[PDB]
Amino acid sequence: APPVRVLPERIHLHELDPNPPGPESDYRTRWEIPIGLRETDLTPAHCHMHTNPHLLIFGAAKSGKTTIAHAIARAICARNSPQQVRFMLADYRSGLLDAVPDTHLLGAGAINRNSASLDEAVQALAVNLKKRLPPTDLTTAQLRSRSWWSGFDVVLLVDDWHMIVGAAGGMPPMAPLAPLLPAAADIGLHIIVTCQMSQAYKATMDKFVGAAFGSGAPTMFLSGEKQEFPSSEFKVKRRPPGQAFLVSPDGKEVIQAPYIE
Ligand SMILES: Nc1ncnc2c1ncn2[C@@H]1O[C@H](COP(=O)(O)OP(=O)(O)OP(=O)(O)O)[C@@H](O)[C@H]1O
Ligand SMILES: [Mg+2]
């Protein structure tokens, strides 16, 4: 009678990521980010952010959204120096002060806790990021190689998308950045967005989260009520905190996302 071992209800980031490679490594190694422990083998699943730049995290109340975003930002910072990565945060509920060490923050206005701050920061970011757009001049050998510009990748770490949408009036938030999203891989842009499950369905059809979702961004479906998001592809159901059905074009599987105090 074989011994039972199930997906543990709490896995620390150091258990998921005991041997992180460092800034010394190449781009591919620096952006192979562990995001959780698979139920099938207690082995890390990864965000291949060197190829698909984004990650979406959907979840009901107290399902672990903020902590997971914290933990994944840490795994990214373990792999990348402040010359290789910079973080801009949307943190309306003010829970991500320590998600990133102040060495890796994108300037003095990196942490935005309200609409006025975020609008200004997103304006400045889009102006800077558009400078990295690929010319039609160059050769496709330079396209995947991203050789026409050098600098840090930008991670847009966005907690509680539903609040940003609600506090934006009727205007779309991230309007300056949404047009650049098709070129995210070419300009080194990564968005990591959490959203309450009750609004995540509406979010999958907007121009920011929906652009990443419709283009195959890996998506954690944490605990939620099936009727908030009933599409049978994803198995939206009540889950322990941190447990998620991870969906990408690369497959669908149950993971335990990392915890961090
Ligand atoms: N990866 C995880 N694994 C297990 N438990 C977790 C994990 N992350 C968070 N938790 C637990 O779940 C609780 C809620 O965590 P957290 O605030 O991150 O979720 P949330 O979705 O941001 O909640 P809120 O609805 O307040 O925004 C915490 O008390 C924490 O102990
Ligand atoms: Mg939260």
Residue numbers in the entry: 318 to 578
What's the paper's own text on this?
EccC, the motor subunit of T7SS, is essential to assemble a stable membrane complex for the secretion process. It contains a two-pass transmembrane domain, an unknown function domain (DUF), and three Fts-SpoIIIE-like ATPase domains (ATPase1, ATPase2, and ATPase3). In this study, we have provided high-resolution crystal structures of ATPase3 domains of EccC proteins from Mtb, all in complex with ATP. In our structures, ATP and a magnesium ion bind to the nucleotide-binding site in a similar manner.
